[PDB]
Each structure stands twice: as structure tokens, then as C-alpha cells.
Amino acid sequence: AVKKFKPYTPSRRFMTVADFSEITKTEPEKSLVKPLKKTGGRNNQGRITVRFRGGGHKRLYRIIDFKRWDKVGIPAKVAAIEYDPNRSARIALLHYVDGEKRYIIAPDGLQVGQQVVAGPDAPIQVGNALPLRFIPVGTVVHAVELEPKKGAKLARAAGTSAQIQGREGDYVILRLPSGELRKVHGECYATVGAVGNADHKNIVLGKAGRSRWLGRRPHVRGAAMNPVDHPHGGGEGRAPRGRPPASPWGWQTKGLKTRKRRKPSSRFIIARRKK
């Protein structure tokens, strides 16, 4: 769900926070956390390369297991469900019968104390990982490798999923969270079910300060600048664009398609995205 507040300040009026209903552990696994290096959007030259970034809360990185075929046949119990500040999804703690402890992103309906497993033979149960080819057409799925053994790259965001539509040769057809219809290799792993914390998008930040907590620095409009800074800069008083809307670097920003035409992966994308 989503928690509202009484309007006892101007900002509490619209602010909403997560209920954190599914969380069962309030601090992470020491062996599974490493220090996150905050960049501020600066590359190794130290130049800002992504604007308007920095100043957010300190975070620890929770090492996530995006392989899972790492430990085929070895079951694990769901020890806990935890908060992860580095992603939208919640994460679940797995104590394998191995005695090994790992983090995966928690699928919807995953419950603590249940058992999950990974492998070709695995049961079609929420929280189980299988190569795509062994998963029944039609079941919803997440954390999908894009290429075999290269790691789960698709559908990791809260509430997202992909759905298996059919098979062709060594490939299956997925409908991605975006509505793109794509061919992904049959030996690519994926976890059945959808990612949890679907209510995540219903969150209203509420005040400028909350964006600031998340490390998002204020975004200043092109139209608010000067010609030296931006195509939309200048003009006496307010001005309309006066040219096709452009980025600070001058390329067109309303409809100009930008994916490279001669990309090798074009052979594997059947239908470009939805809405």
C-alpha cells in the first residue's frame, strides 16, 4: 500500500511513503554489503557527465545475485525480506542449505520461510530460476538474462515483469516491461513471477527536499537560461521555443529516434515498444 499523511505541514499534505509492509529485517547482511562510491555524476575526468546529481543519503551496496545458475539444485529458504536503497525493488535474503547466504530481488508474493530453487528441473513457483526454454509459455517472469550466463539484465524494477509469448528455435519470445517483443535465448535464466513492491509508482515525493534526499539535484529549464547555455536560452521576457525543442547540446528532443539503426540486435527485436 501507500501511507498518506495529514496536512500538518504544507508538504505532508501530498507526501506519500511506502508501507514497508513486507520488510522483516531492518539492517543488512554484513558479509553481503560493500561501500557504494558516490559519483555526483562525475566521470574519471571529474567532469559532470550526467547533470543535476549529488547530495543524497549515504548508501551501502547490497551485493545481488543475478546469476543464480551459480548454485543449481541447491535449495534455499527465504530468511528475510529487506530494504534496498539502491533499487526500487525489495530484496530477499536466502540461506541456502549450503550455508551460503545470498541476496535476490524479491518477487511478488514471495514469503519468508518458503523454499526457492534454481535449475532446468525447478518447479514453476514464484522465486524459482530456470533457463527460459523450460518455462511454460505464458507464465510471467522477471530478472531475465539477455544473453546466456551474462547476468539478469531485464525486468528488475519494482512491479515489472516479462511474459513468455512463444518459442522459435533456440529462442523464446518475451514481452518486455516496455511492450517491446523480443527474442531472448532459450538458455537465458529468469525467475518466475513478477518483481514485488508494485505500489512503488504510487509514491508522491511531496516536497523538493525528498528529491534532494534521493541524490537528485534541481533541474533548471533550458528556457530559463541564456543563449550561451542552451538553444532555448535568451529572449526578452518569456519566450516559446522558437525552433524545434532541443537538448542543451542542440539535438531534437520531441520524437527524434536515437537507437543506432545498424545495431546487430535489430535481428532479435520483433516489434518496437507499446505506448
> Applying CB under 5 A, which of residues 22, 65, 108, 187 lies at the interface with Mg ion?
22
Burial class (CB in 10 A: 0-12, 13-18, 19+), 71: buried
Give dist(CA 106, CA 98) in Å, integer. Answer: 20
Question: Per rule CB under 7 A, is residue 72 in the interface with RNA?
Answer: no
- What letter does residue 181 receive in the DSSP assignment? E
Give dist(CA 252, CA 224) in Å, integer. Answer: 18
Question: Per rule CB under 7 A, is residue 111 in the interface with RNA?
Answer: no
Closest approach, Cβ 142 to Mg ion, in A, equals: 13
> Applying CB under 5 A, which of residues 150, 201, 263, 274 lies at the interface with Mg ion?
150
| Cell matching residue 227 | 543563449
Give dist(CA 49, CA 111) in Å, integer. Answer: 41
Pairing of strands 181-185, 17-18: unpaired
Which residue stretch of 25-33, 112-120, 122-130, 185-193 sits at the interface with RNA (rule: CB under 7 A)? 25-33
- The footprint of RNA on residues 80-109 (CB under 7 A) is 83-89, 95-101
Nearer to Mg ion, 90 or 175 (CB): 90
Closest approach, Cβ 160 to Mg ion, in A, equals: 13
Question: Per rule CB under 7 A, is residue 21 in the interface with RNA?
Answer: no
| Cell matching residue 155 | 525486468
Task: Note whether 81 and 90 are within 8 A (CB).
Answer: yes
Q: Which does 34 bind (CB under 5 to 8 A by kind): Mg ion, RNA, none?
A: RNA
Q: Which does 149 bind (CB under 5 to 8 A by kind): RNA, Mg ion, none?
A: none
Give dist(CA 87, CA 67) in Å, integer. Answer: 17
Question: Per rule CB under 7 A, is residue 267 in the interface with RNA?
Answer: no
SS3 224: helix
- The footprint of RNA on residues 216-235 (CB under 7 A) is 216-224, 227-228, 230-234
- Provide the terminal-to-terminal Cα distance of the chain, rounded to the nearest Å: 26
Residues that bind Mg ion in the complex, under the rule CB under 5 A? 4-6, 15, 18-20, 22, 41, 44, 48, 50-51, 53, 84, 90, 145-147, 150, 153, 180, 184-185, 197, 199-200, 219, 221, 235, 237, 239-240, 242, 272-273
